[PDB]
Amino acid sequence: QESVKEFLAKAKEEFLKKWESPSQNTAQLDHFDRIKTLGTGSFGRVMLVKHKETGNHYAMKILDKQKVVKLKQIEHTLNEKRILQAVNFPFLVKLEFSFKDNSNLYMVMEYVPGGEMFSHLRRIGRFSEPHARFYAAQIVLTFEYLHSLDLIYRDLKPENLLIDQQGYIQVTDFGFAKRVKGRTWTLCGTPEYLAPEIILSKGYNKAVDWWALGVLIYEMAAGYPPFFADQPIQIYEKIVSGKVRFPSHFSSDLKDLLRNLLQVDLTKRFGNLKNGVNDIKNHKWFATTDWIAIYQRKVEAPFIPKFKGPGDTSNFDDYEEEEIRVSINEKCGKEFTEF
Numbered sequence: 425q426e427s428v429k430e431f432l433a434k435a436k437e438e439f440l441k442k443w444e445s446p447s448q449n450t451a452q453l454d455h456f457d458r459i460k461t462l463g464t465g466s467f468g469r470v471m472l473v474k475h476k477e478t479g480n481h482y483a484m485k486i487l488d489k490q491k492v493v494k495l496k497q498i499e500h501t502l503n504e505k506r507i508l509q510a511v512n513f514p515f516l517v518k519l520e521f522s523f524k525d526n527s528n529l530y531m532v533m534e535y536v537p538g539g540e541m542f543s544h545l546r547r548i549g550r551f552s553e554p555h556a557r558f559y560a561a562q563i564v565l566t567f568e569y570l571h572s573l574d575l576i577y578r579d580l581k582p583e584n585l586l587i588d589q590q591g592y593i594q595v596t597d598f599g600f601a602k603r604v605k606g607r608t609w610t611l612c613g614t615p616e617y618l619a620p621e622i623i624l625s626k627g628y629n630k631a632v633d634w635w636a637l638g639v640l641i642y643e644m645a646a647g648y649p650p651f652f653a654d655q656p657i658q659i660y661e662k663i664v665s666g667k668v669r670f671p672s673h674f675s676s677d678l679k680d681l682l683r684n685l686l687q688v689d690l691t692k693r694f695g696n697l698k699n700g701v702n703d704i705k706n707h708k709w710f711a712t713t714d715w716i717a718i719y720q721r722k723v724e725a726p727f728i729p730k731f732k733g734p735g736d737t738s739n740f741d742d743y744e745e746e747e748i749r750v751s752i753n754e755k756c757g758k759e760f761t762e763f
């Protein structure tokens with residue numbers, strides 16, 4: 425429909441203007457008070473902070489430059505910030521400020537207090553098909569937007585979907601996102617969600633995001649992922665076999681959609697055929713979905729997370745609290761000139 429085509433044409437114009445002239449150096453560390461560590465990882469962490477003049481809360485991602493270099497993540501870190509400052513969509517967490525100092529890189533994002541989808545799924549066991557479908561529809565629209573900008577996301581998993589104050593999804597962590605016009609080759613992502621062409625070290629494309637959507641829909645509706653096993657090597661053997669067993673409680677329409685997303689041959693996989701995303705939006709499993717109402721946030725959500733206010737951390741867990749130290753000498757200045 426021409427309305428969708430004109431929406432995506434404007435979205436790409438606005439993205440390219442910011443892509444070609446990125447914002448830089450829009451806050452500094454002593455403009456914020458540190459409150460609590462919300463998550464940790466290999467080269468960085470995310471902290472709840474409060475802005476000292478406005479009182480607004482944010483989620484500040486802190487990356488150690490020396491560790492980014494040692495773990496060979498320089499290009500990935502530069503991709504994450506340049507993409508986040510250029511995108512704009514209802515189901516993506518927004519970047520509000522970025523800056524660097526002698527030791528670290530900082531991305532100051534909006535704080536989403538309802539928790540990871542992963543925590544809520546594991547609490548309740550599994551989601552009903554209507555509940556899974558509401559979240560899946562938001563990921564379909566988000567991938568339609570990103571892929572039209574020539575972006576591949578490459579980190580879909582339940583931990584990266586946050587539930588907001590209206591019960592809608594916001595996608596976080598763009599550390600593996602990349603602008604790709606043809607093929608790309610890096611090994612990255614979490615094992616249970618990798619497409620066969622990544623495990624086999626091929627040149628791959630946006631079809632890996634549609635495979636990961638099949639894994640996510642299966643895990644939401646069953647309570648566990650389709651290729652589960654105790655060690656990565658055994659997970660990878662199941663994935664490239666592609667043999668999938670479905671619970672008897674799944675509907676016939678759900679099984680049919682998942683066989684077409686979890687297709688081992690990327691040239692036959694839904695999302696990657698001549699009709700693109702419309703083979704997914706027009707599938708019988710989505711017949712009750714009002715795509716415009718979801719985009720406009722007019723559908724009542726399946727549940728609203730319990731929290732007391734914009735500063736409540738109850739839906740996140742507890743981590744050892746470490747210093748944010750800044751060296752008196754500059755580190756790795758050349759590598760991060762463009763940040």
Ligand SMILES: Cc1n[nH]c(C)c1[C@H]1C=C[C@@H](O)C1
Nearest residue numbers: 462463470483533534535536
């Ligand atoms: C919550 C939140 N709001 N915005 C961001 C970037 C977050 C991260 C903090 C811990 C991770 O689970 C997600």
